[PDB]
From a paper:
The SARS-CoV-2 Omicron variant of concern evades antibody-mediated immunity that comes from vaccination or infection with earlier variants due to accumulation of numerous spike mutations. The Omicron spike (S) glycoprotein, which promotes viral entry into cells, harbors 37 residue mutations in the predominant haplotype relative to Wuhan-Hu-1 S, as compared to approximately 10 substitutions in both SARS-CoV-2 Alpha and Delta VOC. The Omicron receptor-binding domain (RBD) and the N-terminal domain (NTD) contain 15 and 11 mutations, respectively, which lead to severe dampening of plasma neutralizing activity in previously infected or vaccinated individuals. To understand the Omicron antigenic shift, we determined cryo-electron microscopy and X-ray crystal structures of the spike protein and the receptor-binding domain bound to the broadly neutralizing sarbecovirus monoclonal antibody (mAb) S309 (the parent mAb of sotrovimab) and to the human ACE2 receptor.
The larger fraction of open RBDs, relative to the apo and S309-bound Wuhan-Hu-1 S ectodomain trimer structures, could result from the Omicron mutations, the prefusion-stabilizing mutations or S2L20 binding. Whereas most VOC have only a few mutations beyond the NTD, RBD, and furin cleavage site regions, the Omicron spike harbors eight substitutions outside of these areas: T547K, H655Y, N764K, D796Y, N856K, Q954H, N969K, and L981F, which could all be modeled in the map. Furthermore, N969K forms inter-protomer electrostatic contacts with Q755 and L981F improves intra-protomer hydrophobic packing in the pre-fusion conformation. The latter mutation is close to the prefusion-stabilizing 2P mutations (K986P and V987P) used in all three vaccines deployed in the US. Putatively enhanced interactions between the S1 and S2 subunits in Omicron S along with pre-fusion stabilization, and altered processing at the S1/S2 cleavage site due to the N679K and P681H mutations, might reduce S1 shedding, consistent with recent studies.
Author numbering:
A (entry chain J): 1 to 126
B (entry chain K): 2 to 11, 15 to 105
C (entry chain B): 298 to 371, 376 to 474, 489 to 621, 641 to 676, 689
D (entry chain A): 14 to 18, 21 to 68, 77 to 143, 156 to 176, 186 to 210, 212 to 214, 9215 to 9217, 215 to 245, ...
E (entry chain H): 1 to 104
F (entry chain I): 1 to 61, 63 to 121
The structure:
Amino acid sequence: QVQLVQSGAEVKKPGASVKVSCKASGYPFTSYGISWVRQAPGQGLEWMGWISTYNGNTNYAQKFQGRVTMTTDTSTTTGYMELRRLRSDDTAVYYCARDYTRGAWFGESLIGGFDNWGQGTLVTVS
Amino acid sequence: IVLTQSPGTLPGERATLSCRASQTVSSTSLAWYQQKPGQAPRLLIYGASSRATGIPDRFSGSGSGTDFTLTISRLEPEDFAVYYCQQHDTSLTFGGGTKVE
Amino acid sequence: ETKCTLKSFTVEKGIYQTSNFRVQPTESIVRFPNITNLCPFDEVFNATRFASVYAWNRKRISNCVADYSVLYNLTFKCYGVSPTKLNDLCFTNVYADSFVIRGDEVRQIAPGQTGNIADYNYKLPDDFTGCVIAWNSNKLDSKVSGNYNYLYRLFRKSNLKPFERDISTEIYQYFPLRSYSFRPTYGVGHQPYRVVVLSFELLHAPATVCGPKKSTNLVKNKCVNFNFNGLKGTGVLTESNKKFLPFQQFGRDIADTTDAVRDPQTLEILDITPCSFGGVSVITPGTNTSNQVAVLYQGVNCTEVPNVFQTRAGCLIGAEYVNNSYECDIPIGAGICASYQTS
Amino acid sequence: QCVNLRTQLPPAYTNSFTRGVYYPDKVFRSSVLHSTQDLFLPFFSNVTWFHVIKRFDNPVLPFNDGVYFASIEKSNIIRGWIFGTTLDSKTQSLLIVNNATNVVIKVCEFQFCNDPFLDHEFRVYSSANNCTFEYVSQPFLFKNLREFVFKNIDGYFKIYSKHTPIIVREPEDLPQGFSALEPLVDLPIGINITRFQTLLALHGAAAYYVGYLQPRTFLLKYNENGTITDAVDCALDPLSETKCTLKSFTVEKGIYQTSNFRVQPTESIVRFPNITNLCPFDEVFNATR
Amino acid sequence: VIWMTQSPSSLSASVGDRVTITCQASQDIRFYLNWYQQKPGKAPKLLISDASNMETGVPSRFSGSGSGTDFTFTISSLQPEDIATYYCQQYDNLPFTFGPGTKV
Amino acid sequence: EVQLVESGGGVVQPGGSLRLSCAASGFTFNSYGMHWVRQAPGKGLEWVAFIRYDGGNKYYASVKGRFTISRDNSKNTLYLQMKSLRAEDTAVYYCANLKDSRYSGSYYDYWGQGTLVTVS
Ligand SMILES: *[C@@H]1O[C@H](CO)[C@@H](O)[C@H](O)[C@H]1NC(C)=O
Ligand SMILES: *[C@@H]1O[C@H](CO)[C@@H](O)[C@H](O)[C@H]1NC(C)=O
Ligand SMILES: *[C@@H]1O[C@H](CO)[C@@H](O)[C@H](O)[C@H]1NC(C)=O
Ligand SMILES: *[C@@H]1O[C@H](CO)[C@@H](O)[C@H](O)[C@H]1NC(C)=O
Ligand SMILES: *[C@@H]1O[C@H](CO)[C@@H](O)[C@H](O)[C@H]1NC(C)=O
Ligand SMILES: *[C@@H]1O[C@H](CO)[C@@H](O)[C@H](O)[C@H]1NC(C)=O
Ligand SMILES: *[C@@H]1O[C@H](CO)[C@@H](O)[C@H](O)[C@H]1NC(C)=O
Ligand SMILES: *[C@@H]1O[C@H](CO)[C@@H](O)[C@H](O)[C@H]1NC(C)=O
Ligand SMILES: *[C@@H]1O[C@H](CO)[C@@H](O)[C@H](O)[C@H]1NC(C)=O
Ligand SMILES: *[C@@H]1O[C@H](CO)[C@@H](O)[C@H](O)[C@H]1NC(C)=O
Ligand SMILES: *[C@@H]1O[C@H](CO)[C@@H](O)[C@H](O)[C@H]1NC(C)=O
Ligand SMILES: *[C@@H]1O[C@H](CO)[C@@H](O)[C@H](O)[C@H]1NC(C)=O
Ligand SMILES: *[C@@H]1O[C@H](CO)[C@@H](O)[C@H](O)[C@H]1NC(C)=O
């Protein structure tokens, strides 16, 4: 009965930043990581990065290495992502998912995938 | 690693979807996803073979080296969706996506 | 009962104490704190890649709840400990040693054994305490062209000491390491197996790893046998108006008696009292006149005990209360007396 | 990079009065007077007073059997502590540092600077090796009065703390009144602490006080809400001794027998016959026949 | 009781020469050794603590090292001001003890 | 400045007794343990006794059973009571605070000037 609940749609101006939350329930928060994937209209799935809910370690995609910051809060079992310096090309739906592709405690690769996904948060830049 | 899928666009008939890697991908590091219109993607196959919980038996994946496939023994009205291949042998990437129609 | 107590086939007029009323517990209420952090066994056993036996990898497990059900759920030999009792033990540390060997080499991962793995790659102590888990990984590790990534040590000038690791490549007076070359066309004895050894450390020190506990639902306003996170006792659980501080787990009365607890899961305060009890006395005329009796339950409520009259001295059953007034005969207390009267 | 930042001034002293009482255990009690024996700062003791003003007192002090620490400030200059023995790369040491969002506690073989400090970055140590303990939680830290008790028993580093606002008085001394310290954290570290040092952050004025705990008997008064509101030091004076014996903060007029007077011996006197010959055990045990 | 000894008991050296003094413990005292320097008519001054840590104010020409039972005290270049009796002292356990003393 | 001042020395007869004292100032005397060390003409440094900061635990060297160590933290004064003095006890007696990372915890090393005691 795992669920991921994301914030609603946001509208931002070029140069602005957006903060997208993802509330998790139905499982031990510190046993699984959190990954973020975005999908622009008409496009496929693009990986943004991963964070461990246990030790705060991160692994970012090169494309967002200097733009995206990911954090977690284990007291409210909620993940957060912030994307800085938004451009018109960043209009997309941003999804959170439960990560079982990398361990949260050891950082090693696991045999798995992204099983639970949130509904997605639409971010528009104009 | 770059993942190339085909065909661009493909009820009761058997469907096969392909994903070719530019580099060798371990079976332990490859997975398949399904995305219905208006919905988030869901995991179908992990380890290139094992089914994710809740996935019907008509869905089965296999492969080795650089050549992996996903097979649907019989297409149902609800199986018409965009499918993606994923690898995390190196970093983590998704394929272009293949549409079943 | 009175006759036996007084050792007499005869009983004189009066009131005697012959026994005691005590309510027994009917249930067992077990309450423990719920797990918030769990031991990362999943990230050890479901890993994509295992280390070579010549260079075995050690992962440390600490400060977590050890749920072993999954390992039972999915070779599983425990030494010094039962695999079905691990759920109720605590350890100061747990160490998981992961490596890949051949099926025929699995027998070497045990105390008292010898062989080219036991002696040159991975040695266990004769007094080893822990569990060895292994499974066939042919589907993942074997390759058609041959998997040469896994290596073992064949040559060395001496045998290893327990949990010693040697990853040097110095030439033996031969190159000391040789590949397994695993293939899907091999018979079982030559197929790859993934081995995880769980070493259980028990020291005179605070535990960091503990298995989970069984618990039941909370029952109130009834006589029960209870245990709150080790806090044992018998009695009736009720709500409480006590103001506990954020760090206090239980409280005591002036007599240093536990009289309130904090519930591990709901964090509510419950008051505790002993189950109803009191003395039992028999009121009787001399047996030379009559064998009729009445029974007084001292300090007990008439609805607790199971011609019923409630007085300050307790519940009197068997005697008929009247609104008349006579000289006191057999005194009970609080202005009330009993007598044998006219049939 | 360690930065060597002074003269040495003589210490000041202040009057502790009635402070340093903490909840001895995690047990709820109410409407009762409870007698307990534990390490407490003695009542009306002499407490060492250090200043941070161009002078910054941050000497290495002995830990002895436990330390009472208190500070008064607004600028949050005192942000952490170092506990250990040699305070160098040869032994494990405990480093407790607070910052804006969290507190980090770790035990490692740190090579500490000659004069360690924070600079908002860590210039506390030049390097560290293999750690044995890690812990992260919420920050531990009119003027702010912060009081701590540091104990190290059976491997457990126990921290008690209290934070109250205080009115500013010109003498800039310790305030009177009774306030009990609640338990904060209990760290299963297992190291030998004999020295400690206070870490100051640079970028104002502050002061702190250091006292040492002793094994003493106290009578603690718990009110209706299980809060300690008063206490008696049973080894302070003859009046407190009577109060403890009669389990009452109030003594009625009269004469009470509370103790016993006994003269102690001052010398060791040993007297034996003067014999120089040794017993021939050798000629019994090493015999040929 | 841990017994301490030093060697040589007395040494002859000129200014500019390298001087070494050996201190040996009958028992393993890890790194808990102090080195003192005493001039005639004066109380002993501490130069080195915990085997190898220099005291503040002590010239860089002084050094020392060692662990367990065998410890060394060195003067990289003897000065005219370095003529004194040197002692080693253990504080691993009570009673504390000083060595015989080495005359420079 | 930190000072340690010994006094109470002098000349006594064998079998007699002498009480020495050391006045401390300039430092937190009552937080530190203290040592006595003696040095006879022609000999090296000899450790005599140690007392903890609270005046609780006491340790003795050759002198155990004859010498007593004590302190008064309200006067910042350290005492050594020597009974049954022998010719061999002729020495200069120092009070000191010895740098010690294991027991006293002292991070600073202080010495007095010493007082001469002669037994004859
Ligand atoms: C444990 O119980 C507490 C309080 O009832 C609850 O808030 C917490 O989420 C529970 N933890 C888990 C992992 O379910
Ligand atoms: C490995 O992952 C599978 C799929 O989620 C799970 O069923 C299995 O129990 C896991 N193995 C372990 C040891 O957790
Ligand atoms: C018992 O009752 C009879 C009358 O029926 C009387 O005569 C006798 O004395 C009584 N005995 C005692 C012990 O009361
Ligand atoms: C006995 O029980 C009745 C019914 O609950 C109650 O009203 C009465 O006060 C009780 N008396 C005593 C002594 O408990
Ligand atoms: C005694 O009289 C009262 C009325 O005052 C009545 O309620 C009660 O039941 C009577 N009891 C008996 C035993 O007659
Ligand atoms: C501080 O003193 C040390 C010697 O103890 C020296 O190595 C270091 O360079 C000095 N720091 C600075 C900034 O000069
Ligand atoms: C130490 O405490 C005593 C009281 O026992 C007091 O008389 C003395 O003045 C205090 N010392 C200092 C330096 O204040
Ligand atoms: C406080 O310390 C934590 C843990 O080291 C760190 O993640 C955080 O960024 C620090 N906060 C600030 C403001 O430096
Ligand atoms: C690990 O700790 C030991 C002390 O037990 C130390 O000697 C060793 O050098 C440390 N390892 C590293 C890489 O610092
Ligand atoms: C801590 O002190 C005790 C008592 O002196 C000693 O036995 C123990 O070995 C010390 N621990 C270490 C690491 O030195
Ligand atoms: C106990 O707490 C209540 C508030 O819950 C307060 O009104 C009452 O005065 C407190 N009693 C004491 C003695 O402080
Ligand atoms: C030794 O003992 C004898 C008695 O047997 C006594 O007469 C003599 O005086 C003693 N010697 C000394 C030195 O006291
Ligand atoms: C017997 O003689 C040997 C050799 O000198 C010695 O080591 C041993 O202690 C003697 N045994 C006894 C009881 O003296």
